[PDB]
Amino acid sequence: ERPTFYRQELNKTIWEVPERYQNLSPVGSGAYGSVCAAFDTKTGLRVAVKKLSRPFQSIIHAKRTYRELRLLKHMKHENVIGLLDVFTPARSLEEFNDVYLVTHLMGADLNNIVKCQKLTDDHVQFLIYQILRGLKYIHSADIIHRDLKPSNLAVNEDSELKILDFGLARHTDDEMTGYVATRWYRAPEIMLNWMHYNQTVDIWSVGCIMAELLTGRTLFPGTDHIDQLKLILRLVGTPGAELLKKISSESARNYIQSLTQMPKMNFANVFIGANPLAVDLLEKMLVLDSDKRITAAQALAHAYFAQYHDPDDEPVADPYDQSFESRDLLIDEWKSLTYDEVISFVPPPL
Numbered sequence: 001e002r003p004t005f006y007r008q009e010l011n012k013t014i015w016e017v018p019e020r021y022q023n024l025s026p027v028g029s030g031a032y033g034s035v036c037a038a039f040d041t042k043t044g045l046r047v048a049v050k051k052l053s054r055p056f057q058s059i060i061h062a063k064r065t066y067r068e069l070r071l072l073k074h075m076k077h078e079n080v081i082g083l084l085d086v087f088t089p090a091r092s093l094e095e096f097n098d099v100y101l102v103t104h105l106m107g108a109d110l111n112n113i114v115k116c117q118k119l120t121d122d123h124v125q126f127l128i129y130q131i132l133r134g135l136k137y138i139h140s141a142d143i144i145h146r147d148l149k150p151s152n153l154a155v156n157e158d159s160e161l162k163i164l165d166f167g168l169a170r171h172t173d174d175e176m177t178g179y180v181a182t183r184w185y186r187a188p189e190i191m192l193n194w195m196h197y198n199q200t201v202d203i204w205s206v207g208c209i210m211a212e213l214l215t216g217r218t219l220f221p222g223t224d225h226i227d228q229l230k231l232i233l234r235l236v237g238t239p240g241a242e243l244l245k246k247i248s249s250e251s252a253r254n255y256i257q258s259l260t261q262m263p264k265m266n267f268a269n270v271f272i273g274a275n276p277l278a279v280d281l282l283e284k285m286l287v288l289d290s291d292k293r294i295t296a297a298q299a300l301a302h303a304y305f306a307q308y309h310d311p312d313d314e315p316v317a318d319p320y321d322q323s324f325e326s327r328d329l330l331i332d333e334w335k336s337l338t339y340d341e342v343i344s345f346v347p348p349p350l
């Protein structure tokens with residue numbers, strides 16, 4: 001039942017894919033992989049095919065490959081990216097070297113929407129509602145996104161949203177340096193390595209995205225890590241004794257204590273004309289102490305989403321076994337586990 005594969009060179013990369021995928025066209029490249037737009041003749045869908053770059057070159061790369069495949073195979077929610085297909089041209093484990101992942105082709109992202117269109121409060125309500133509905137699902141599987149930003153949120157013509165991770169490069173220090181969107185939505189505990197972070201790092205990002213949908217502007221466009229921290233503390237206030245004790249890094253803790261103390265600002269005076277319910281929700285998401293930050297499940301029940309909230313239609317994920325994360329294996333073992341996952345893949349129904 002193995003399909004027939006055909007080969008083509010696209011931007012000095014050899015692509016070998018089943019015949020069902022036609023009109024391959026390059027849409028992106030990076031350290032982790034290359035992405036092509038294509039037409040799936042079997043389903044009639046416009047798809048995105050990601051060919052992973054050297055997926056088993058090191059233990060780190062082999063584990064990352066296995067990790068992404070496990071995660072994609074698990075995600076089954078209206079607001080989260082789904083795996084349409086996974087394939088390899090390899091006929092056996094011995095010849096296994098390449099992995100291709102297929103998802104829906106995404107049109108616009110949230111950055112394209114905020115660009116020329118000024119969003120109304122009802123539009124903001126619907127977009128944030130869906131992010132939180134998708135996050136509640138991601139978090140219920142004990143998965144932390146870590147990189148929620150407008151470019152990782154796909155929004156169709158009907159304002160239907162999906163959470164994705166379209167990143168193709170290594171999230172290095174250099175990539176996070178300066179006046180960069182890669183760091184503007186990051187929680188201060190992850191950006192400054194304050195302590196062992198939890199999934200509320202993602203709620204900080206939603207708060208940053210919501211503020212930007214409401215004003216059309218970046219909430220914390222820092223020119224560097226320290227300038228961004230100062231922009232944060234000006235709005236939310238400098239931390240109290242309770243939070244400083246939770247900063248496990250003595251160096252980071254010592255730096256914060258050197259700053260002049262500042263009170264939390266009045267958010268109604270920052271977000272002029274915004275719905276007072278939006279302002280209230282923003283104050284619950286943009287909390288410096290991650291332990292006190294509203295969760296996705298708590299946020300869906302907030303009065304700001306009264307028009308969309310349906311507790312009978314906000315599902316949680318099936319149990320997700322990620323015991324593999326603390327497993328020490330050789331490249332060939334991570335490869336064989338990846339291979340079993342490719343061959344056991346069951347496509348979703350129409």
Ligand SMILES: CC(=O)Nc1cn2cc(-c3cc(NC(=O)c4cccc(C(F)(F)F)c4)ccc3C)ccc2n1
Pocket residue numbers: 027028035048049050068071072075080081101102103104105106107138145163164165166167
């Ligand atoms: C115009 C256009 O459509 N361009 C486009 C489409 N693209 C699609 C992909 C793409 C991305 C993944 N991986 C993830 O999304 C991912 C990984 C980990 C966690 C999560 C989360 F679930 F936590 F979000 C999601 C798998 C397969 C493909 C094909 C990459 C770049 C891209 N560019």
